[PDB]
Design a protein around this nucleic acid. Structure first.
Lengths: 98, 93, 107, 7, 83, 95, 86, 107, 93
DNA sequence: TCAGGATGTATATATCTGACACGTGCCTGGAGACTAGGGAGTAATCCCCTTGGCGGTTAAAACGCGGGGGACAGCGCGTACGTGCGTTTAAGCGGTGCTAGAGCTGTCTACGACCAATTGAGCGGCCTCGGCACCGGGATTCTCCA
DNA sequence: TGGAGAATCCCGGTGCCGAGGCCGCTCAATTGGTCGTAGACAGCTCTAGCACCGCTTAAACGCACGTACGCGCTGTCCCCCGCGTTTTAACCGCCAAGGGGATTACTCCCTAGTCTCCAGGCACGTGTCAGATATATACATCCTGA
């Protein structure tokens, strides 16, 4: 019989793996293209240093990790294990972004 | 000693926007505190802006950029429009 | 020889000279521009007029002729941009906006 | 553009 | 048969899942991705707005890391390791 | 007799329409003196400072209760609990 | 010559006062354990504010805590208050 | 007479003269006291020493003799007072502390 | 052109603490940024303290009060002790 | 669903006061005018840091509908919170007395600013190796159908 | 409960490139003065914060009672866990352009500084009418009954 794990063990292993690792999780080039497209709406023909994009990616990843932590706390408080968009909305509202 | 405040100026602005509307002492103090806070914020923003550019003079552009950074959207646009009009009419006479 | 206020030159209400003195004595930089006090006075005057218009409208909506901190709080919180500007500011004698959750209502 | 406060 | 592959979807399901796993999330609903993309877009819009304003103030056309760091500090998100 | 809840909403409306202080002045002043005793002895307080402290405390408490009510409603309940306050403070970053 | 030591005035924040504050915030139903946690949070907040206020008082060589010190402490804590000066 | 650094006079590693110049040209006040740079340099050296010893302990606890940003994040987030001091600061390449909620653990 | 940094000072402090430990470049830049941030915070708080007291000179008392206000508890106590020792020994010499 | 009783809430009127609008002296802060120096604008130059196929991999980017545990709705319960009422407690006002300390004012001495001369410590450029990244291999440890 | 199977840690070998040390070369740190002034200190004034008492009365308190909502339990179901490999399916290394960020040199006119002079707002009285308070009354809404 095939040996396929119960749901949840792989999730915990992945959580441990990426909580022990400290490298970027977002593809560099798509994020750079998104940054350039967003900046195009402000000023045309703008140049970006590599270090600026790196700092942008670091800040975005840190903010996303914090937001997901708050969302997980809200989901646990809601007697659930699966995060929902309303959890993110509640976290942002309590923070003060909405 | 004498106390400095913006009470009469706020009163004149209120009369210009509403001739038949009064103002309370507590509301006057709140308005003065708000004006002082905005003044401090804009001055600090301009000072920091000049400092980052190795510049030792706050010009109209520093105040403009501070207004853009601090005031959100339409507030900043109307503020920069009014400031540009005021400085232009001042330097034209 | 006839003196004339700088505010009258720029048609402003807040005093250009006082703003210039505050900028000079605020320990911001070695020097300050000539048009910066005028620009700051214009911005402050616009903000004051904008907040006072809404405050007067709120006071008139409550059959009152003298603006009270409650009207100031209502005017600030009812304006989205002003609410963002003063999102970390609390006003004495202002109270809170009337807001009751839908789920709390009976049905 | 000017004097067009959304409010 | 193609308007199928796109750019704004570049923040893929694996990337958002990896970020959530790093954040401690164990199970993720399918609707999380769009909301996360919107929130990231808003955050990036604000930061880039401040950065471009600083760049325009400095008579420059190239956005440096200094501008991004200064914008983050102005937004209460001071970052270490870039100046 | 009114059904439970109607008086609750009535008081909610009444206090959301009013702006006066909701905390007794003398007990709050005594609490402030007790708290200040832990830092410096024989401290004197102005009336305006006490009023400002009370206003700030009331505003912060109202905001905290608003966040607690939002968290409680998120949990499909209508009764606030200390867990909701703890969650709100944790999300705020105070703990 | 009277050094009065005050204690147990944290109970001076009566349950009806907390209920009124919750009503102003929109709370409809209140558990019985809310009051103690609210009192604890309130005490922590005033401890944090008063520590800075007394520090400012000592710095200025004053024995009386003024409203300006409270406003400065609140602003330093990101809680700027309008209607008392500054 | 040979010149002696003010840092040597106070037995400090940080440069008293450099921080004094930074204070003078930082547009903070019209005048600067003599002992304020020394006191500030001492405080800065104490904070730096605290962070460096914590980072060294973190690196030694991972069989590493080289300080990396991961050790910085570990050291800062493991100290409650320092975490409170740097609760609004993000460290690049610092990572996240291993933290799995009890409810998420298998039961 | 010459660029200011705190590299040698931090390295010497670590050598005094950990004689056999090195630092990566990224962590070293993080150290420099942290030192600059603390410098800016203390200097700004001291300037605010001097402005509030209508003072035009930053002395040891203002910096000490800033340290007490910004550093929590034991950190503030130890920083005050170390700075007071340093200033006393400097005045003696 | 519709209707009456009881309740609170919105509305109109009087009068009555104290907080707001107004007027006034003056003095100190604002306005005029001249000077000098340095910081900002402008011009020219260097070169360092940002963008696309013959003569291209290969693994993310997204196909194939076979498929278990948590989200969700419903239901019963019993305790706990809301609501009302008599008592009692303490908050609030005002009145008096007094003093520690906030606030203002005059010296004048020590402390910092500023300039000139001097020099050594930190910064730019350039090796040089070893701690750390990668990998391969095996022992150890975690998970799962019995 | 226990080995099969897969994931992880450790042991050891090998190659790499970034930190540590070295060596100029400034220019900012140090020292020695001279000179202006900031507030330390002493003295005086006089304001309100403290302490206490007495009266009035509204709110906290304890208790009784009723009902409705959090919680535990049970049953249904769905979606995105999952591996199982296309039709045509993101990083490297390259080489190359060139433009703007950085640097250097002149120059000029804008503002700090100083002196003089004058009137605008700030403290201080002084009236007065808009909301506070009180009462009386009409209307909206909940509760209960049918």
């Amino acid at each position: 019989k095939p040996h396929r794990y119960r749901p949840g063990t792989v999730a915990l292993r992945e959580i441990r793996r990426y909580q022990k690792s400290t490298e970027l999780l977002i593809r560099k080039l798509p994020f750079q293209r998104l940054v350039r497209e967003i900046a195009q709406d402000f000023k045309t023909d703008l140049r970006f240093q590599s270090s600026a994009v790196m700092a942008l990616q670091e800040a975005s990843e840190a903010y996303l990790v914090a937001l997901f932590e708050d969302t997980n706390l809200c989901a646990i408080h809601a007697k659930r294990v699966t995060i929902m968009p309303k959890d993110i909305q509640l976290a942002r509202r309590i923070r003060g972004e909405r | 000693s004498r106390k400095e405040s913006y009470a009469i100026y706020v009163y004149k602005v209120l009369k210009q926007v509403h001739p038949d509307t009064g103002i309370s002492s507590k509301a006057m103090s709140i308005m003065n505190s708000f004006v002082n806070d905005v003044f401090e914020r804009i001055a600090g923003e301009a000072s920091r802006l000049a400092h980052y550019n190795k510049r030792s003079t706050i010009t109209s552009r520093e105040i403009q950029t501070a207004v853009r950074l601090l005031l959100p959207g339409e507030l900043a646009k109307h503020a920069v429009s009014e400031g540009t009009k005021a400085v232009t009419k001042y330097t034209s006479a | 020889a006839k003196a004339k206020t700088r505010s009258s030159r720029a048609g402003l209400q807040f005093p250009v000279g006082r703003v210039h003195r505050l900028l000079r004595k605020g320990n911001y930089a070695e020097r300050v521009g000539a048009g910066a006090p005028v620009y700051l006075a214009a911005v402050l005057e616009y903000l004051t007029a904008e907040i006072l218009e809404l405050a007067g409208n709120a006071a008139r909506d409550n059959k009152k002729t003298r603006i009270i901190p409650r009207h100031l709080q209502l005017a600030v919180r009812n304006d989205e941009e002003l609410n963002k500007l003063l999102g970390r500011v609390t006003i004495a004698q202002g109270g809170v906006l009337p807001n009751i959750q839908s789920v709390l209502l009976p049905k | 553009n000017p004097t067009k406060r959304e409010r | 048969r193609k308007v199928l592959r796109d750019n704004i979807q570049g923040i893929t399901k694996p990337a958002i899942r990896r970020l959530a796993r790093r954040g401690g999330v164990k199970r993720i609903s399918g609707l999380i991705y769009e909301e996360t993309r919107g929130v990231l877009k808003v955050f990036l819009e604000n930061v880039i707005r401040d950065a471009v304003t600083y760049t325009e103030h400095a008579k420059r056309k190239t956005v440096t890391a200094m501008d991004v760091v200064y914008a983050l500090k102005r937004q209460g998100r001071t970052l270490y390791g870039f100046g």
